[model samples]
Target: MKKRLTESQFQEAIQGLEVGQQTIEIARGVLVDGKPQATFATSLGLTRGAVSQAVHRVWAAFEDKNLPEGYARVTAVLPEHQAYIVRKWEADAKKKQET
Candidate 1:
């Protein structure tokens, strides 16, 4: 099972990362009712690649124990790539169904 995090907790997890390197917004979207990455990217005026990189970077930082607060409670919020991929595919299927 996945763990949920508060907005402030999200902020700390991405602390010290450069603006474009942080994936907090992506995680925020996911946490807030599992918003699709594409939709979140469009809403933020950012490319999907940018969002992906942010997610990747943040996840890496958390996984490797390099991020601030160093591995504590980060995993609860840091998203897994597999899960993100699943979310993307699911979102695509949902769109297809809608069409």
Candidate 2:
């Protein structure tokens, strides 16, 4: 049950996202579902690239074992929790591939 997004659809979704919306909130919602990018983007009123960026940034931070010194840093967790979030992303990626 996979539905892919066309370029136009992708662009439309990204264009509709609120400026400065919380990426983490979007990330958690999308990652939790383990659904296709389009599903996440359309459902959350975000762009596919935004979703992709969040996925990459989350995993990159987790892998680096370091959090940037900014707003996200204030809420970022230690390695164990970072690993937990990374595992969720891993599972999401695995689900996409299997589909």
Candidate 3:
């Protein structure tokens, strides 16, 4: 029974990350009207390859759940609490997988 995330919640969490919007765009792509869509690199002033790599780097921190579940980084956050947020997500993901 997981509580769902709202658009504002997602935006808040992503903004909390240590990275800039450009980096987050690369790392998490973008959510549009509740859908997960791949963000274009040029939109973020990045090369496609760089965006891909950034996504991979950030993505590797969590379990391989479908996009939404794995993206708690974009659903719960504070600038100074980003690392802790990632750690919490990773732990929860691991536990979910194990069970």
Query: What does candidate 1 score in Cα RMSD to the true structure?
Result: 11.7
Q: 1 or 3, which is superior by lDDT?
A: 1
Q: After aligning candidate 3 to the native by TM-score, how far in Å is the CA of 10 from where it should be?
A: 8.0
* True lDDT of residue 52, candidate 1: 64
lDDT of 1 by residue, 6-96 (tens): 5665566567756552367676666434566688678878899787666656555443543334223322343588778766865775577
Please report the TM-score between candidate 1 and the true structure. 0.43
Off by over 4 Å in 3: 1-18, 30-39, 64-99
TM-score of each: 0.43, 0.37, 0.33
What ranking of all candidate models by lDDT puts the best one first? 1, 2, 3
Evaluated at residue 31, the lDDT of candidate 1 is 49
Residue runs of model 1 more than 4 Å from their true location after superposition: 1-12, 20-23, 31-33, 66-99
Q: Global CA lDDT of candidate 1, please?
A: 0.58
Query: Is candidate 1 or 2 superior in lDDT?
Result: 1
Residue 42's lDDT within candidate 1 is: 88
What is candidate 2's TM-score against the reference?
0.37
